[PDB]
C-alpha cells in the first residue's frame with residue numbers, strides 16, 4: 001500500500017501525503033499490536049526484524065515522495081527520473097529481502 | 109515470631125556461601141547486580157526478636173523499552189517533522205500530519 | 213537387625229518428648245543456622 | 259531441666275475446659291486488645307476494599323492458668339493456644355482475611 005503511492009499522480013499532493021502518514025501510523029499500531037503478543041524479552045526476535053525492515057521500507061517511500069515534492073517545480077526531470085526508478089527499485093529489494101529472510105529463518 | 113532474642117539466635121551458615129544459586133538466576137527483564145546478607149535484632153512492643161535479611165539489587169534492562177516505547181515516539185516525531193518540507197500552500201496535508209501525530 | 217535397632221532408637225528418642233518446649237527451655241538461647249538455595253525468581257510485578 | 263516444665267504444663271492442662279470462658283460465673287472477661295500495622299496495603303478503589311497486615315494482640319486474665327516455677331513467663335509454642343480458651347474476635351467488615359502459616363502458624367502465647 002505504501003508502494004502504490006508512487007504510481008499516483010505527481011500533482012496530487014494531498015493524496016500521497018495521506019498515503020504516507022497513514023501507512024506509517026498503521027505500521028506503528030501494528031508494531032505495537034504484534035509486539036503485544038510476546039513476553040518482555042531484552043533481545044530482538046525475528047518478527048521484530050521483519051517489522052523493522054517493513055517500517056524502513058515505508059519511511060523510504062515516504063521520504064521519496066517528500067524528495068519528489070521538494071524537487072518538483074525546479075528540476076521536474078530529476079523528479080521524474082527518481083520516481084520512475086523507485087517504482088522498480090523498491091519491489092525488487094523487498095522481494096529479495098523476503099526471500100533471504102524466509103530462507104534464513106526456515107532452515108534452522 | 110514467638111521467640112525473643114533471649115530464646116533464639118539466627119545466623120547465616122557460612123555467612124557468605126549461605127545463599128547460593130543467585131548467579132544462575134536468569135530474569136527476563138531485570139538482572140541481579142548484587143545481593144547482601146544482614147543480621148539484625150528488631151524491637152517490637154513485645155520484645156526484641158532476631159532477624160536475617162536477604163537483599164537483592166535488580167537493574168532493569170532497557171532493550172525492551174527502547175524497542176517498544178522510545179522508538180515509536182521518536183519516529184512519530186520524525187514523521188511530524190515532514191510537515192516542514194511540504195509547501196506552506198498545502199492546508200490539508202500539513203494539518204493531517206500534525207493532527208495524526210498529536211493523537212498518536 | 214539393623215532396622216529394628218534404628219526403630220528402637222527412634223522410638224526411644226520420641227518417647228517422653230515435649231514439643232511445646234524448645235531445646236534448652238530454661239537456659240541460653242538456641243542457635244538456628246540458616247541456608248537458602250534460591251531456585252528461581254519468577255515474576256517482578258510493578 | 260525440662261521435666262519440671264513438662265510437669266507444670268501438664269498440671270495446667272489437667273482439668274481444663276476450653277469451652278468455658280475464664281470466670282464464667284462471677285466475672286465478665288476483659289480482653290485488652292492492641293494492633294500493630296506492619297504495612298498498610300493497597301486501597302483497592304474498584305472493590306471499595308483495602309488490605310492491612312497487622313500484629314493483632316490480645317490479653318485476658320485466666321485464673322485457671324496460674325503456676326509457680328523457676329521461670330516467670332512461659333513463652334510457649336503456638337500449639338498450646340488451641341488447648342486453652344481464646345476469644346473469638348472477628349472483624350465486622352473483613353471480607354477475606356488470611357492467617358499466615360509460614361513456616362509455622364504465626365501465633366504466640368506468653
Ligand SMILES: *[C@@H]1O[C@H](CO)[C@@H](O[C@@H]2O[C@H](CO)[C@@H](O[C@@H]3O[C@H](CO)[C@@H](O)[C@H](O)[C@@H]3O)[C@H](O)[C@H]2NC(C)=O)[C@H](O)[C@H]1NC(C)=O
Nearest residue numbers: 140141142143144145146147148160161162163164165166
Ligand atoms: C538494599 O537495601 C537494603 C535496605 O536498606 C540495604 O541494607 C543495608 O545494607 C547496609 C550495608 O550492608 C547496612 O549497613 C550496615 O549498618 C550496620 C548498622 O550497625 C553496620 O553495623 C554495618 O557494618 C553496615 O554499615 C544497612 O544496615 C542495611 N539496611 C538495613 C535496613 O538493614 C542493602 O545494602 C541494599 N543493597 C543490596 C545489594 O541489598
Ligand SMILES: *[C@@H]1O[C@H](CO)[C@@H](O[C@@H]2O[C@H](CO)[C@@H](O[C@@H]3O[C@H](CO)[C@@H](O)[C@H](O)[C@@H]3O)[C@H](O)[C@H]2NC(C)=O)[C@H](O)[C@H]1NC(C)=O
Nearest residue numbers: 231232335336337338340357358359360361362363364365
Ligand atoms: C498450618 O501449619 C500447621 C503446622 O505446620 C499445620 O498443622 C498440622 O496439621 C496436620 C493436619 O491438619 C496435622 O496432621 C494430622 O496429624 C494427626 C495426628 O495428630 C493425624 O491424625 C491427622 O490425620 C493429620 O495427619 C499435623 O500434625 C499438624 N502439625 C502441627 C505441628 O500442628 C496445619 O495443618 C496448617 N494449616 C494449613 C491450613 O495449612
